């Protein structure tokens, strides 16, 4: 998982999958938006949050061998940590889940 809290705008830095990650979460009107940084260099900006759909959409960035992040439901900062969780998945698990998505 990824520990979270019920704040409208927030950011987290952690070491996941033998690399450093920095996830910034903020609310944009209705939907919730995130900005993903790995090892000090940006990856994607302003990606929307939906249940199941991974945050890293583009093919190259998400992994040659790294992992990804998925939400259990639609994002809502008033429910963070309270029935709402964010999960990081390693390369093998995410590859299997992606194949199962079809």
């Amino acid at each position: 998982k990824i520990p979270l809290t019920a704040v409208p705008n927030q950011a987290i830095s952690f070491n996941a999958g033998s690399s450093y990650w920095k996830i910034r979460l903020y609310q944009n009107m209705d939907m919730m938006n995130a900005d993903i940084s790995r090892d000090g260099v940006i990856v994607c900006h302003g990606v929307r949050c939906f249940g199941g759909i991974p945050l890293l959409q583009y093919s190259h960035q998400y992994r040659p061998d790294y992992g990804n992040f998925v939400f259990d439901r639609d994002a809502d900062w008033t429910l963070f940590g309270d029935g709402i969780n964010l999960f990081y998945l390693d390369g093998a698990e995410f590859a299997e889940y992606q194949a199962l998505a079809t």
């Binding site: 959409q57 583009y58 093919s59 190259h60 040659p64």
Partner: protein, 404 residues
């Protein structure tokens, strides 16, 4: 809704203030000049940056174009390495080979060792190789050099038994705009010719593909003379480490007939005489009929006669100018593919797209089969009409430049 007008913007605020507060000033010295000017310097940013996020046009776009690709193509590319195996080294007695022992090939090898090894009483041991970069590179048939050594390991040995896995090379948006029009596949049982071409073009390490289809019987207007309803595919693949997936991709997208060279034509090299023999089908069907051929490889030669130009252009840049158009890394010109009609107008005109200011007095080009001596001094024309059996290639040494 593609372009923005900003000449009338300043008037808008210069009269908004006038009909808002009173009819006075709107001059340049007073305080109101400042407000009127800033409300326009920021209105222009509004008008420009509201449009620029619109286009979405497949061209003009950038970065966000990854999503216009992902609407149809599930993948663009990837970033892997040219990992090796089955290596061997010339060595002595009881030497302790270490990791990261760097072996450099003459064409920029810079190759580590993947796992440690210890020399045996025989004097020859096997070590693994991984490339220090993430692009597609090939190892030479013989051993070249060793950098990290214990003065007892004599030389690294390349053999025929070894394998070569070919990696991909990152991405280029100006190349995404090119292969987008080709990699678009379809959504029934996957049995159209365009579906075949788009599915095959997405396999890794495949530079170009050609597909043609009969519909009529006897002969077809495209090249090919044999079977009555054939399907001719002329894949240009650097390699198939999945030697069956290069065939399984063809099979899964294929319904009809599979001939070799349209079936009975000549002077095209196929993969073999007997069938390609795919491994298996998941629908309990042991049907193995897949046939494809590789192009008849050729050579290239380019010569040019250039004036001095306006700037101090080195004669080395013009050589790199043409290799990109040959490799198709420019935005707009596809590159050298099957039936690429090598022309002097298409090439020597495009060299001005990187080094303008020079006057091209003359340029004439020609080519011959690969691994053969250069043509005669009078053996150069403007065009080279190219058949669909093969493709041409250009190297750095084949280009000769005279500043006459």
């Amino acid at each position: 809704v593609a372009d923005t007008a900003d000449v009338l913007s300043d008037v808008e605020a210069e009269f908004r203030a006038a009909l808002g507060a009173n009819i006075n000033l709107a001059a340049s010295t007073p305080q109101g000049s400042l407000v009127a000017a800033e409300a326009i310097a920021r209105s222009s940013v509004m008008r420009n940056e509201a449009r620029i996020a619109n286009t979405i046009n497949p061209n003009v776009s950038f970065g966000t174009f990854l999503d216009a690709i992902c609407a149809l193509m599930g993948i663009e590319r990837g970033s892997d390495l040219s990992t090796f195996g089955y290596g061997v080294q010339v060595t002595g007695r009881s030497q302790t080979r270490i990791s990261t022992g760097s072996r450099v090939q003459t064409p920029a090898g810079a190759i580590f060792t993947v796992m440690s090894d210890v020399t045996i009483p025989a004097g020859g041991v096997a070590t693994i190789d991984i490339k220090s970069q993430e692009y597609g590179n090939i190892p030479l048939p013989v051993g070249n050099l060793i950098i990290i050594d214990g003065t007892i390991g004599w030389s690294g040995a390349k053999v025929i038994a070894s394998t070569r896995v070919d990696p991909g090379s990152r991405q280029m948006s100006d190349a995404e705009l090119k292969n987008a029009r080709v990699n678009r596949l379809a959504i029934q049982g996957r049995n159209s010719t365009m579906a075949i071409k788009a599915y095959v073009s997405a396999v890794p390490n495949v530079t170009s593909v050609n597909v043609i289809e009969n519909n009529t019987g006897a002969v077809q207007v495209v090249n090919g003379v044999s079977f009555t309803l054939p399907y001719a595919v002329w894949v240009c693949v650097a390699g198939n480490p999945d030697k069956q997936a290069v065939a399984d991709a063809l099979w899964a997208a294929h319904n009809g007939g599979t001939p070799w060279d349209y079936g009975a034509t000549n002077n095209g090299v196929p993969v073999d005489g007997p069938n390609g023999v795919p491994v298996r089908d998941p629908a309990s069907g042991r049907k193995y009929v897949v046939k494809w051929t590789t192009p008849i490889m050729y050579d290239g030669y380019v010569n040019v006669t250039v004036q001095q130009g306006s700037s101090s252009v080195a004669p080395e840049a013009i050589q790199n100018a043409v290799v990109n158009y040959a490799q198709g890394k420019v935005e707009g010109e596809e590159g050298l593919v099957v039936g690429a009609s090598l022309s002097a107008f298409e090439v020597a005109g495009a060299i001005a797209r990187e080094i303008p200011g020079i006057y091209i007095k003359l340029c004439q080009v020609a080519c011959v089969a690969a691994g053969s001596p250069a043509p005669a001094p009078g053996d150069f024309t403007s065009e080279y009409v190219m058949s669909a059996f093969g493709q041409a290639t250009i190297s750095v040494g084949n280009v000769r430049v005279t500043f006459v």
